[PDB]
Amino acid sequence: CPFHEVFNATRFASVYAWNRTRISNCVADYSVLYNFAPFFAFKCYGVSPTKLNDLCFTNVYADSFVIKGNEVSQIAPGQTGNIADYNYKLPDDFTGCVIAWNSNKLDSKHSGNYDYWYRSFRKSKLKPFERDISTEIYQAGNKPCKGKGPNCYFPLQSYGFRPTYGVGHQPYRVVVLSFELL
């Protein structure tokens, strides 16, 4: 039943290497999430926000990462992008919720927060609930290579969060949840 914590994890994973934490059978008192912060986005697709407490499931995962504001909507069933195509793809039959809240200070620096990486380039689009930790150089072209400088590119890409940026550019912590039944 970890929810007082997964969300308030400093150094949230970046989206390319999103951190998944399993929630076993516990008190299941996640109705307290509504009393943590004014979430920018709280979108429960397969379940209803009023039916969270009474409805019961078997296993829960707390997928957490950091994205921009122009990229929170990309965390949804479908909704192509870079955060959904190459970093975090949500199945069309997603049953959990999507919880994203601004963290433009918790995760911004005036000199630049070059710590949260997102993968801009990849060969194939990610399958639902797939992780691509691998960081081998991308080809982005057709003369096989050994290092960047030609059309070959580094697959990962920093975010460059400033203590100051457009809301849609500001850092956003997203501890998505994953319900599944055996």
Binding site: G69, G112, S120, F121, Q139, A140, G141, N142, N151, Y153, Q157, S158, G160, R162, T164, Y165, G166, V167, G168, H169, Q170
Partner: protein, 597 residues
């Protein structure tokens, strides 16, 4: 394999790096322009040099993707912007030679002294004093001085630098597969690659002539009225059939005639609109003159201003301690950060200029969704035109009646309605002939059409036939009278102002049609008309992604720029200048010359 268009992936890599590095360059440029210190300017220069080096290396990388194999209507434009390869194809001590030439011209223009025979130690630059002298002196002597002496101690030394600048820019442009540097400047208006929208570079010249032709009478009548109103302030110095002396035009070059307003007033007893004496009894602070500008922009539908705009823009003046450039500047820092650097002293001019800078920032927010290289005006004269149409919609006396500046009992007599409209026509008109003449002279000079030993000749010929302004003393080839202007001795394309004037009046006419305006165009404000919000935003959303002709069609409805909305703006006061000049000889004679007496 991989499509040549893989430049897409390349541009995706470039855009993220460009967005981050441009933000660092702009933020460093921001905190300097508000907080000048040695460390701040050093940071700005470091960030700018890093950003320029990044553009250079990305251009070298983009050399690999030929536009011939690209077809996406947006990827090709970004590739063209990257691999334009301007001033870098030029030879090492050529672009640099010009670089030093450009710097020398900039420092001669900015740091140049002119001073009287009687006191050779009380010398003033065109910025301090010389400027004022042309705006306040209103003399014929004190104005003939500081004009010829500005062309002689500054223009003469700018002449060799400009002669080398023209040729060096000529090979710089020709190595970019152009024909001259005028063609390089017109290349911002190039539109080919778009079915239907195929604006060529020479078509810009073609249409500026075919719009100045319709600009002529409005001007000729305004020039005749100004001449008639300058023969009672300079009674024995201007012929009623000749041109206007160049030092009697309110400023150094005769660009704007707005400083001739006091001399040329339709009705001097009727005060013009000025709410500075009205919004100090309402105790407006610095914020509110912007808070009711944002209101204006949320009246038409344009969204609110971002929270990072009130908390990050210095709208309350430098603050009397740090040093702060005070030019009203809208700033699009980068990733979603739009600010305005404007030192707002409570004044009607500052109110209109705040509306101007907010129009600029609204346009920036609109095309922020576009890719980075397409984050600009669709051509040279759309962004500034949006700013000025916002200013015009703010300045209407009817707009300042929902705002409690004017009492709810006011009614501009046609008198001030001609007073204000002539005040505007001295700024708008009077620079259209000046802009067209100057940029036409530059365009010919670049293709060598104007032999060097004829430059000044042609210059002062054009001033006599196009602008209707005669030189007060004959300028042989030792002078470089155009270079005496900021945009000429600083490598700034100047036709952007002519095109921007045409665009702004087309925008105003179209937005007033969308707002269902009924009266005269100059009395029209776009406020509270959300249908004129989603008629310009259809163009504001489009940056350089779509051709500027397509953007104009989206907002105005016409493929090419039109001058009729500009004339429809001044159809009142056009009837009035036709009535006033019933005795005055409308037009001018290029033969007339002050020294010819």
């Amino acid at each position: 394999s991989t499509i040549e268009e893989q430049a897409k992936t390349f541009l995706d890599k470039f855009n993220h790096e460009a967005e981050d590095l441009f933000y660092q360059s702009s933020l460093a440029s921001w905190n300097y322009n508000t907080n000048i210190t040695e460390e701040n300017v050093q940071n700005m220069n470091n960030a700018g040099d890093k950003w320029s080096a990044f553009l250079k290396e990305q251009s070298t990388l983009a050399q690999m993707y030929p536009l011939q194999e690209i077809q996406n209507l947006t990827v090709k434009l970004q590739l063209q912007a990257l691999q334009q390869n301007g001033s870098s194809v030029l030879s090492e001590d050529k672009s640099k030679r010009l670089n030093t030439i450009l710097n020398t011209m900039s420092t001669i223009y900015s740091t140049g002294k002119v001073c009287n025979p009687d006191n050779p130690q009380e010398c003033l630059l065109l910025e301090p004093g010389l400027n004022e002298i042309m705006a306040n002196s209103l003399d014929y002597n004190e104005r003939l001085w500081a004009w010829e002496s500005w062309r002689s101690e500054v223009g003469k030394q700018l002449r060799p630098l400009y002669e080398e600048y023209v040729v060096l820019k000529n090979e710089m442009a020709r190595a970019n597969h152009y024909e001259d540097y005028g063609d390089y400047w017109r290349g911002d208006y190039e539109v080919n690659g778009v079915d239907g929208y195929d604006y060529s570079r020479g078509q810009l010249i073609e249409d500026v002539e075919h719009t100045f032709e319709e600009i002529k009478p409005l001007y000729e009548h305004l020039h005749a009225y100004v001449r008639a109103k300058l023969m009672n302030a300079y009674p024995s110095y201007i012929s009623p059939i000749g041109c206007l002396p160049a030092h009697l035009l309110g400023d150094m070059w005769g660009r704007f005639w707005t400083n001739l307003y006091s001399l040329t007033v339709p009705f001097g007893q009727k005060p013009n609109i000025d709410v500075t004496d009205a919004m100090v009894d309402q105790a407006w602070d610095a914020q509110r003159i912007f808070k009711e500008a944002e209101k204006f922009f949320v009246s038409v539908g344009l969204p609110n201003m971002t929270q990072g705009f009130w908390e990050n823009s210095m709208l309350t003046d430098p603050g009397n301690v740090q040093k702060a450039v005070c030019h009203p500047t809208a700033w699009d820092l980068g990733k979603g950060d739009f600010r305005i650097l404007m030192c707002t002293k409570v004044t009607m001019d500052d109110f209109l200029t705040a509306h101007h800078e907010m129009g600029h920032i609204q346009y920036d927010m609109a095309y922020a969704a576009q890719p980075f290289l397409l984050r600009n005006g669709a051509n040279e004269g759309f962004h500034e035109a949006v700013g000025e149409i916002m200013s015009l919609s703010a300045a209407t006396p009817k707009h300042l009646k929902s705002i409690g500046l004017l009492s709810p009992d006011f009614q501009e007599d046609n008198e001030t309605e001609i007073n204000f409209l002539l005040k505007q026509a001295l700024t708008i008109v009077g620079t259209l002939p000046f802009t067209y003449m100057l940029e036409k002279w530059r365009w010919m000079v670049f293709k060598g059409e104007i032999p060097k030993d004829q430059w000044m000749k042609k210059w002062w010929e054009m001033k006599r036939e196009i602008v209707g302004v005669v030189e007060p003393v004959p300028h042989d080839e030792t002078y470089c009278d155009p270079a005496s202007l900021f945009h000429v001795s600083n490598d700034y394309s100047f036709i952007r102002y002519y095109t921007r004037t045409l665009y702004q009046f087309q925008f105003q006419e179209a937005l007033c049609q969308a707002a269902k305006h009924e009266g005269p165009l100059h009395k029209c404000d776009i406020s509270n008309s959300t249908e004129a919000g989603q008629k310009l935003f259809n163009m504001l959303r489009l940056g350089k992604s779509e051709p500027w002709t397509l953007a104009l069609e989206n907002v105005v409805g016409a493929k090419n720029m039109n001058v009729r909305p500009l004339l429809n703006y001044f159809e009142p006061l056009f009837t009035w200048l036709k009535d006033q000049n019933k005795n005055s000889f409308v037009g001018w004679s290029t033969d007339w010359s002050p020294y010819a007496d």
